[PDB]
């Protein structure tokens, strides 16, 4: 019932104290783009906020969008490259991941 699997981790240095910093485990079609993954992070947070204490809620589920998160992938150079929102996951897997394992992506709230 789905395709590429990946682990979303909070960016190792950009995160702040009151940021939601969940590691997430997902699967979706290779044609999903980075913008879909960004929007997913926002929507999932928004859903969790519905039952949160609510001191620094940042999301409204109604308007959550791909603009709320920046997505990165680590490179062999040790660089964390920002992925363009238009990129498909298949493209990212082919051109940036190159490992026979679930893809590892990082995120940071924008910014």
């Amino acid at each position: 019932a789905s395709e590429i699997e990946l682990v979303f981790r909070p960016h190792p240095t950009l995160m702040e104290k009151d940021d939601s910093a969940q590691t997430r485990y997902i699967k979706t079609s290779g044609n999903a783009t980075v913008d879909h993954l960004s929007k997913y992070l926002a929507v999932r947070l928004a859903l969790e906020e519905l039952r949160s204490k609510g001191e620094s809620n940042q999301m409204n589920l109604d308007t959550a969008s791909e603009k709320q998160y920046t997505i990165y992938i680590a490179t062999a150079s040790g660089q964390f490259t920002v992925l363009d929102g238009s990129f498909s996951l298949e493209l990212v897997s082919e051109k940036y991941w190159k490992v026979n394992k679930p893809m590892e992506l990082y995120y940071a709230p924008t910014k």
């Binding site: 019932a1 485990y25 699967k27 044609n31 999903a32 879909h36 997913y40 026979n100 679930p102």
Partner: protein, 31 residues
Amino acid sequence: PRLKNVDRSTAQQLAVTVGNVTVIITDFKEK
């Protein structure tokens, strides 16, 4: 390449649309 540390039964779905393209993103709880 499948995740190995997740509880598959916890699978939850979100249809995510950007422009005119919708995908289903399924997520899992760590096991």
